[PDB]
Design an enzyme around this catalytic site. Structure first.
Site, PDB file in Angstrom:
ATOM      1  N   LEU A  80      -3.295   7.489   5.302  1.00 40.10           N
ATOM      2  CA  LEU A  80      -2.462   8.418   4.557  1.00 40.10           C
ATOM      3  C   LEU A  80      -1.078   7.836   4.492  1.00 40.10           C
ATOM      4  O   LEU A  80      -0.322   8.089   3.559  1.00 40.10           O
ATOM      5  CB  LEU A  80      -2.372   9.760   5.279  1.00 40.10           C
ATOM      6  CG  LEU A  80      -3.661  10.558   5.270  1.00 40.10           C
ATOM      7  CD1 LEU A  80      -3.394  11.971   5.767  1.00 40.10           C
ATOM      8  CD2 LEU A  80      -4.207  10.561   3.857  1.00 40.10           C
ATOM      9  N   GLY A  81      -0.750   7.068   5.520  1.00 40.88           N
ATOM     10  CA  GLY A  81       0.564   6.487   5.649  1.00 40.88           C
ATOM     11  C   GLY A  81       0.773   5.922   7.038  1.00 40.88           C
ATOM     12  O   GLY A  81      -0.088   6.031   7.924  1.00 40.88           O
ATOM     13  N   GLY A 114       4.071   5.077  10.017  1.00 42.34           N
ATOM     14  CA  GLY A 114       5.448   5.262  10.417  1.00 42.34           C
ATOM     15  C   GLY A 114       5.914   4.063  11.206  1.00 42.34           C
ATOM     16  O   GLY A 114       5.286   3.003  11.179  1.00 42.34           O
ATOM     17  N   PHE A 134       5.730   3.433  14.309  1.00 42.16           N
ATOM     18  CA  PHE A 134       4.884   2.973  15.403  1.00 42.16           C
ATOM     19  C   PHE A 134       3.406   3.367  15.306  1.00 42.16           C
ATOM     20  O   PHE A 134       2.608   2.970  16.149  1.00 42.16           O
ATOM     21  CB  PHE A 134       5.466   3.412  16.755  1.00 42.16           C
ATOM     22  CG  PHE A 134       5.538   4.914  16.935  1.00 42.16           C
ATOM     23  CD1 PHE A 134       4.438   5.632  17.399  1.00 42.16           C
ATOM     24  CD2 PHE A 134       6.718   5.602  16.665  1.00 42.16           C
ATOM     25  CE1 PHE A 134       4.502   7.007  17.579  1.00 42.16           C
ATOM     26  CE2 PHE A 134       6.788   6.974  16.827  1.00 42.16           C
ATOM     27  CZ  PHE A 134       5.675   7.681  17.293  1.00 42.16           C
ATOM     28  N   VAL A 137      -1.593   7.026  10.212  1.00 42.67           N
ATOM     29  CA  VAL A 137      -2.218   8.332  10.038  1.00 42.67           C
ATOM     30  C   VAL A 137      -3.415   8.245   9.090  1.00 42.67           C
ATOM     31  O   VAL A 137      -3.346   7.588   8.045  1.00 42.67           O
ATOM     32  CB  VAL A 137      -1.193   9.353   9.511  1.00 42.67           C
ATOM     33  CG1 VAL A 137      -1.871  10.676   9.231  1.00 42.67           C
ATOM     34  CG2 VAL A 137      -0.058   9.526  10.528  1.00 42.67           C
ATOM     35  N   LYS A 191      -3.753  10.321  14.208  1.00 42.68           N
ATOM     36  CA  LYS A 191      -2.744   9.266  14.305  1.00 42.68           C
ATOM     37  C   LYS A 191      -3.019   8.381  15.505  1.00 42.68           C
ATOM     38  O   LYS A 191      -3.318   8.871  16.587  1.00 42.68           O
ATOM     39  CB  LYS A 191      -1.344   9.864  14.418  1.00 42.68           C
ATOM     40  CG  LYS A 191      -0.247   8.831  14.447  1.00 42.68           C
ATOM     41  CD  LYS A 191       1.122   9.463  14.576  1.00 42.68           C
ATOM     42  CE  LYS A 191       2.182   8.378  14.658  1.00 42.68           C
ATOM     43  NZ  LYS A 191       3.577   8.918  14.636  1.00 42.68           N
ATOM     44  N   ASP A 198      13.788  14.283  12.241  1.00 39.41           N
ATOM     45  CA  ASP A 198      13.321  13.658  10.997  1.00 39.41           C
ATOM     46  C   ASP A 198      12.978  14.715   9.955  1.00 39.41           C
ATOM     47  O   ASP A 198      11.942  14.672   9.280  1.00 39.41           O
ATOM     48  CB  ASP A 198      12.131  12.734  11.269  1.00 39.41           C
ATOM     49  CG  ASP A 198      11.876  11.750  10.134  1.00 39.41           C
ATOM     50  OD1 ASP A 198      10.829  11.078  10.176  1.00 39.41           O
ATOM     51  OD2 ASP A 198      12.698  11.665   9.186  1.00 39.41           O
TER      52      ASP A 198
HETATM   53  N1  LIG Z   1      -0.993  17.761   9.605  1.00 38.38           N
HETATM   54  C1  LIG Z   1      -1.026  17.160   8.390  1.00 38.38           C
HETATM   55  N2  LIG Z   1      -1.655  17.709   7.318  1.00 38.38           N
HETATM   56  C2  LIG Z   1      -1.695  17.092   6.120  1.00 38.38           C
HETATM   57  N3  LIG Z   1      -1.121  15.891   5.897  1.00 38.38           N
HETATM   58  C3  LIG Z   1      -0.456  15.247   6.891  1.00 38.38           C
HETATM   59  C4  LIG Z   1      -0.376  15.849   8.223  1.00 38.38           C
HETATM   60  N4  LIG Z   1       0.330  15.006   9.003  1.00 38.38           N
HETATM   61  C5  LIG Z   1       0.664  13.935   8.254  1.00 38.38           C
HETATM   62  N5  LIG Z   1       0.201  14.093   6.993  1.00 38.38           N
HETATM   63  C6  LIG Z   1       0.383  13.115   5.909  1.00 38.38           C
HETATM   64  O1  LIG Z   1       0.242  11.802   6.452  1.00 38.38           O
HETATM   65  C7  LIG Z   1       1.129  10.918   5.753  1.00 38.38           C
HETATM   66  C8  LIG Z   1       1.914  10.002   6.687  1.00 38.38           C
HETATM   67  O2  LIG Z   1       2.407   8.975   5.825  1.00 38.38           O
HETATM   68  P1  LIG Z   1       3.929   8.439   5.832  1.00 38.38           P
HETATM   69  O3  LIG Z   1       4.493   8.549   7.231  1.00 38.38           O
HETATM   70  O4  LIG Z   1       4.642   9.131   4.691  1.00 38.38           O
HETATM   71  O5  LIG Z   1       3.723   6.887   5.439  1.00 38.38           O
HETATM   72  P2  LIG Z   1       4.778   6.052   4.544  1.00 38.38           P
HETATM   73  O6  LIG Z   1       6.053   6.048   5.362  1.00 38.38           O
HETATM   74  O7  LIG Z   1       4.117   4.698   4.417  1.00 38.38           O
HETATM   75  O8  LIG Z   1       4.868   6.820   3.242  1.00 38.38           O
HETATM   76  C9  LIG Z   1       2.079  11.774   4.932  1.00 38.38           C
HETATM   77  O9  LIG Z   1       1.712  11.699   3.556  1.00 38.38           O
HETATM   78  C10 LIG Z   1       1.809  13.180   5.400  1.00 38.38           C
HETATM   79  O10 LIG Z   1       1.916  14.127   4.345  1.00 38.38           O
END
Ligand SMILES: Nc1ncnc2c1ncn2[C@@H]1O[C@H](COP(=O)(O)OP(=O)(O)O)[C@@H](O)[C@H]1O
Ligand SMILES: Nc1ncnc2c1ncn2[C@@H]1O[C@H](COP(=O)(O)OP(=O)(O)O)[C@@H](O)[C@H]1O
Ligand SMILES: [Mg+2]
Ligand SMILES: [Mg+2]
Lengths: 346, 350
Positions: free
Chosen positions: A28-29, A31, A33, A36, A50, A168
């Site tokens: 999904l993405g 961070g 460290f 996800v 994660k 954040d």
């Molecule tokens: N509890 C959750 N329910 C739905 N989506 C989530 C949840 N936790 C994280 N996400 C999704 O996981 C992703 C993490 O990616 P992100 O940190 O944005 O990566 P990048 O920095 O490469 O864009 C985000 O799009 C966030 O919306």
């Protein structure tokens, strides 16, 4: 003589077994460290998972702290953030492969999937899809800003009450939770601090730390200033009052408000331009309106102008240059901006 | 009176216009401070494109340093790394959308696509596919280790010669370049330092900078050890000799060698297990062989054992606990491990 081997200790959440979790390939993405993924828990529960990045210094330790703060929030501030479903730790032999739908070696954290859309994604699609996701009846900039900010400030107030500073806060870390009436929930406590000794502070230290440059005041990338004493169980309360680390979240919330209220500020470059001008006029909203707003011909500030400029005033409070002048999220919640309409004639 | 404003300034490379670049959705990857995508340049050149992460502090400054170092490497050490094609900076109104195949607002870096598979990916599929990708006629662990390490150490020696320490050497950052005979090229100078004043040091400071813990000695996550003099124009050469930041790359290269040489060490867990044991016996390769190798009946150390344990000895040189004892990449190149066997190739020689 050879040293004997011994058991490996693995952390586990009651009711959650590795066999119960299918991971969906494709992050999904990612961070600083961790990474996800989407998952399915017990056949029909949509979850997010994660793990720690193998190529990042201290990643497991960073994830452990995120875990600790997630437990704290789960116990003390339910509903402010994505629902925390615990952890699962796997060894090397018993680790699988993501592309084959199995958890790999190491510690994993699990939350409910609160929704496919972040406030960043929604607002950039437009006020209409954002309002729809939020179940916001007043589908205008002013309407979505009122609903979203009431929810965000309410949740930040509850987090701060139990000693957590999120660190954040931004649209990308807010999800409109469709299953809970569209209410906004925070995600990503990966940089969060526990600022009270319960039993000890976590991720709380003097000096600069991780920050999103778009949502942190450029000269205030710390929760405790570099000169501050290291936090202890004995000085924590004093430091909270002296240095007001929660006000880091206040500034970020102000940035959220600006983007919700003004369509042209929803791009990174848009908000960056605003903040540069805001700093240039001395972090003075009225000076911005008088000296700068004329330059913003392509934008519409009506949501902030409305009702005696209530929105502008709330932004000013959340975004004072000095922390000692900056509103707490709890105080901000009581602002005129959130007043019920008078005499509605139903 | 009103302020007059003025034009935007955008950085560009002659001959590279954003209209000629199509970006493919779906990050190829993302590191600490940036995101990489595949692209197509001028309709038929496969390229790779990198921008900064919007959510990371000073990612902007880190990408600028990567750019500067790439320009330095392009001028001074051609062929060591992926070919650098320059930068493209976009503004707000001219900025596009990744989904529309157009470059978004901000600074972008561009390189030739040097190949679809990294040494990490290949080695994990097997020595055979790795050897094929490398055009390595000797398709054995020993064969691929010899060829890959000669190329890697050669390139690191050239980079060090022009003052650059890569700081992220690992199989994941090596590509067997199909269009240059399969020779290995380094990618990802995002962590790299320019350690000499040419005219100024870049990304060079005391303390634990970014490091991939798998490829960095646990207690040496720095180029310069903290407290020690901040790098300046006149202490630069002194610090180079004293703290030997290039030996950071030496250790990483040793890790690469271990994984190339021993199939069982190609997993994170495998290499991690070995380095823990190696540390446990005092970073002494002979001690490992004597006290531990019996615990590795799962694995085959033949490539390191070969020819009087030459491979083991080169690993020891590259992976001495102390930087003062650790071989430079240049020195490592002349090691017996790289020698031709007596009468090698005799059966077909003219
Ligand atoms: N509890 C959750 N329910 C739905 N989506 C989530 C949840 N936790 C994280 N996400 C999704 O996981 C992703 C993490 O990616 P992100 O940190 O944005 O990566 P990048 O920095 O490469 O864009 C985000 O799009 C966030 O919306
Ligand atoms: N010049 C290049 N040619 C071909 N591929 C490249 C080039 N530069 C980077 N890449 C690819 O981009 C990806 C970056 O992903 P990243 O997450 O940074 O590393 P990792 O492979 O450790 O996940 C890598 O898979 C790499 O192979
Ligand atoms: Mg009114
Ligand atoms: Mg940007």
């Amino acid at each position: 003589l050879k040293a004997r081997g011994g058991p490996k200790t693995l952390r586990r959440t009651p009711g959650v077994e590795p066999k119960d979790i299918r991971v969906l390939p494709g992050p999904l993405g990612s961070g600083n460290f961790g990474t996800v993924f989407r998952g399915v828990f017990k056949g029909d529960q949509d979850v997010v998972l994660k793990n720690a990045k193998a190529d990042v210094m201290a990643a497991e330790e960073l994830l452990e702290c995120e875990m600790d703060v997630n437990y704290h929030v789960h116990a003390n501030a339910k509903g402010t953030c994505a629902r925390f479903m615990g952890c699962i730790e796997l060894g090397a032999k018993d680790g699988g492969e993501i592309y084959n739908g199995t958890l790999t070696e190491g510690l994993w954290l699990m939350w409910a999937n609160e929704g496919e859309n972040t406030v960043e994604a929604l607002m950039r699609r437009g006020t209409a899809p954002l309002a729809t996701a939020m179940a916001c009846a007043d589908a205008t900039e002013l309407g979505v800003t009122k609903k979203a900010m009431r929810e965000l400030l309410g949740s930040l107030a509850r987090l701060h009450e139990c000693g957590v500073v999120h660190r954040d806060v931004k649209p990308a870390n807010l999800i409109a939770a469709e299953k809970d009436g569209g209410v906004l929930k925070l995600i990503d406590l990966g940089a969060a601090a526990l600022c009270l000794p319960l039993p000890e502070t976590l991720n709380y230290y003097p000096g600069d730390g991780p920050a999103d440059p778009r949502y942190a005041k450029a000269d205030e990338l710390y929760l405790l200033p570099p000169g501050s004493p290291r936090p202890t169980k004995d000085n924590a309360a004093k430091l909270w009052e002296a240095h007001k680390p929660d006000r880091f979240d206040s500034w970020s919330a102000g940035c959220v408000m600006l983007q919700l209220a003004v369509v042209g500020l929803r791009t990174d470059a848009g908000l960056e331009r605003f903040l540069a001008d805001y700093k240039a006029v001395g972090y003075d909203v009225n000076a911005f309106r008088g000296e700068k707003s004329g330059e913003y011909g392509t934008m519409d500030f009506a949501a902030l102008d409305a009702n005696g400029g209530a929105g502008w005033d709330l932004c000013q409070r959340l975004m004072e240059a000095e922390r000692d002048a900056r509103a707490s999220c709890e105080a901000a919640l009581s602002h005129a901006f959130f007043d019920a309409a008078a005499l509605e004639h139903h």
